[PDB]
Amino acid sequence: MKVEVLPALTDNYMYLVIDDETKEAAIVDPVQPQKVVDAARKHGVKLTTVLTTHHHWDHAGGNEKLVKLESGLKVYGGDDRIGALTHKITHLSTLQVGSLNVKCLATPCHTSGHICYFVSKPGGSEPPAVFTGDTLFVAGCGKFYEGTADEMCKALLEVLGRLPPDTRVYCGHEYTINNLKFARHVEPGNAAIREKLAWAKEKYSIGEPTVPSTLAEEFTYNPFMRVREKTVQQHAGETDPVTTMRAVRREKDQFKMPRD
Amino acid sequence: MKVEVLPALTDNYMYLVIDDETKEAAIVDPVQPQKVVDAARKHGVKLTTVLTTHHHWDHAGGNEKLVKLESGLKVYGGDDRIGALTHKITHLSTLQVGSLNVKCLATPCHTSGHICYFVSKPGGSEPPAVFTGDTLFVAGCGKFYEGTADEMCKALLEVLGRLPPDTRVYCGHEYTINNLKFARHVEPGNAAIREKLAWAKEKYSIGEPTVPSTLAEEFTYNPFMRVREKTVQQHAGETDPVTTMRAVRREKDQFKMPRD
Numbered sequence: 014m015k016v017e018v019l020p021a022l023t024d025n026y027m028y029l030v031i032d033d034e035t036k037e038a039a040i041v042d043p044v045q046p047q048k049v050v051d052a053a054r055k056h057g058v059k060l061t062t063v064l065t066t067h068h069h070w071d072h073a074g075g076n077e078k079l080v081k082l083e084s085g086l087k088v089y090g091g092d093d094r095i096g097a098l099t100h101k102i103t104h105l106s107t108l109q110v111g112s113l114n115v116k117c118l119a120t121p122c123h124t125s126g127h128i129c130y131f132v133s134k135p136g137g138s139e140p141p142a143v144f145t146g147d148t149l150f151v152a153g154c155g156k157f158y159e160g161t162a163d164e165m166c167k168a169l170l171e172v173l174g175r176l177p178p179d180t181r182v183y184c185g186h187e188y189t190i191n192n193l194k195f196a197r198h199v200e201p202g203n204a205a206i207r208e209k210l211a212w213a214k215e216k217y218s219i220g221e222p223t224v225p226s227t228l229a230e231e232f233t234y235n236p237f238m239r240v241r242e243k244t245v246q247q248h249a250g251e252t253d254p255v256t257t258m259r260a261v262r263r264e265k266d267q268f269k270m271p272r273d
Numbered sequence: 274m275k276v277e278v279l280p281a282l283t284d285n286y287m288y289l290v291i292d293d294e295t296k297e298a299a300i301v302d303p304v305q306p307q308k309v310v311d312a313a314r315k316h317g318v319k320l321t322t323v324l325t326t327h328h329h330w331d332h333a334g335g336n337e338k339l340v341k342l343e344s345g346l347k348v349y350g351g352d353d354r355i356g357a358l359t360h361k362i363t364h365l366s367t368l369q370v371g372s373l374n375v376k377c378l379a380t381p382c383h384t385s386g387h388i389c390y391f392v393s394k395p396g397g398s399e400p401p402a403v404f405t406g407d408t409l410f411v412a413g414c415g416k417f418y419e420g421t422a423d424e425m426c427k428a429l430l431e432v433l434g435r436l437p438p439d440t441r442v443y444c445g446h447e448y449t450i451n452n453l454k455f456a457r458h459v460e461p462g463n464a465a466i467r468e469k470l471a472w473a474k475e476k477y478s479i480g481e482p483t484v485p486s487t488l489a490e491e492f493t494y495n496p497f498m499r500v501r502e503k504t505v506q507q508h509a510g511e512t513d514p515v516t517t518m519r520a521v522r523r524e525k526d527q528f529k530m531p532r533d
């Protein structure tokens with residue numbers, strides 16, 4: 014398996030997921046289709062599938078066009094608002110990309126139709142990948158536009174959180190630095206935050222993406238993934254993960270980003 | 274002048290403003306009219322005037338019924354939505370209640386037609402009074418249902434804020450304890466807040482209203498009146514009173530009240 018990170022718009026990431034065995038590939042959130050087709054040509058792969066994390070235009074807005082550029086494409090998504098949708102899927106739906114196995118995980122909150130795609134190589138020895146759209150970011154999470162703190166708690170801790178720790182996290186946007194500046198405010202004594210921020214500033218400095226991260230890593234520095242930790246709860250002044258989730262999300266929403 | 278505080282509903286306050294000379298009186302926000310009538314009868318005074326701070330039902334909801342219980346009433350307000358008006362007033366409108374002088378102050382924000390009433394007796398042998406409805410509370414302010422942070426800033430610091438410091442503040446509700454618990458969170462090092470909170474808790478215990486406060490006191494413990502203070506701005510992460518106002522109000526809107 015190969016995952017090529019493709020920057021789009023201002024801070025979006027599209028992901029070309031390649032099956033080495035068959036050369037078949039899937040494209041996650043193809044908002045800039047010519048860019049997808051170029052990457053597909055560059056890697057010599059055959060694009061057969063579109064995996065849409067949610068209906069927000071910055072993620073699904075290129076589906077109509079890509080389908081006119083490439084025939085035969087199967088467009089997956091868990092929301093009728095997604096353009097050019099061909100295969101409406103739900104929690105635990107599965108599909109294959111060549112030899113790769115894709116498991117659809119419903120993570121409603123950011124949007125009610127949000128789907129994260131867990132991709133693995135059956136029998137393989139390579140770590141799997143999870144495409145988390147605007148549900149889980151590196152050190153952050155999406156705003157709760159169509160959902161509650163309870164829903165995000167379930168998405169992050171019970172659905173994504175139970176995937177293997179070595180799962181690579183490929184999220185919707187390049188928000189890592191700001192996410193970590195917020196994480197640093199929530200837990201000033203947490204060194205994993207501070208070192209991941211040093212690392213992200215350096216990547217930013219040289220024009221390289223901060224994805225992927227791993228789930229084990231998110232449990233060390235992402236305040237939303239750490240709503241069960243006593244340090245995060247005490248910062249919020251709560252004693253359960255759902256109310257801590259609600260408080261930390263509201264806090265992040267009004268947080269003024271420091272310049273360093 | 275004599276101001277009789279009259280509790281109504283669950284935490285509302287109506288105010289019978291008595292001119293001890295002519296034995297004439299005005300009533301502020303007469304939501305429970307029969308209660309008003311008994312009060313006027315207990316104090317041997319003739320009700321002549323109704324002063325309405327704003328159209329919300331818990332303030333203006335008894336106007337039509339009061340006019341039906343009492344004839345010849347003059348009913349003032351600065352908003353067409355107020356029932357039973359006889360006189361529509363605006364910023365700086367003046368009127369008299371017996372020997373008392375009344376000055377209308379427009380404080381749009383909570384509602385667009387909100388009016389605060391400044392009452393004084395000529396040849397100041399006693400402190401004036403300001404009836405602030407849902408604009409200024411003891412240690413708090415009203416939600417910005419029909420206006421902006423700029424508007425509340427003006428209403429509080431420039432329109433009310435510039436009245437004599439000894440002016441008594443008679444607000445629409447008994448929200449003092451909760452207001453100060455939020456204030457304490459904004460400024461944990463402010464002794465005036467913790468002292469007023471302890472006092473408010475005791476007044477609540479013996480069934481005594483926390484009104485009136487004075488404008489001078491409000492400047493020592495009300496976060497909304499203190500948006501020019503470095504401590505409040507630091508809490509909000511801002512450096513100007515208007516953005517501080519916006520941030521502090523948004524925060525209070527979603528603040529979880531602690532048990533003590």
Ligand SMILES: C[As](C)(=O)[O-]
Pocket residue numbers: 069071147155186
């Ligand atoms: C803030 As969005 C439009 O990337 O869900």
Ligand SMILES: C[As](C)(=O)[O-]
Pocket residue numbers: 329331407415
């Ligand atoms: C919350 As209200 C109805 O007293 O403006």
Ligand SMILES: [Cl-]
Pocket residue numbers: 264
């Ligand atoms: Cl805060």
Ligand SMILES: [Mn+2]
Pocket residue numbers: 198264
């Ligand atoms: Mn904070």
Ligand SMILES: [Mn+2]
Pocket residue numbers: 458459508524
């Ligand atoms: Mn706060």
Ligand SMILES: [Zn+2]
Pocket residue numbers: 067069123147155
């Ligand atoms: Zn989105």
Ligand SMILES: [Zn+2]
Pocket residue numbers: 069071072147185186
């Ligand atoms: Zn997005």
Ligand SMILES: [Zn+2]
Pocket residue numbers: 327329383407415
């Ligand atoms: Zn009101």
Ligand SMILES: [Zn+2]
Pocket residue numbers: 329331332407445446
């Ligand atoms: Zn009210």
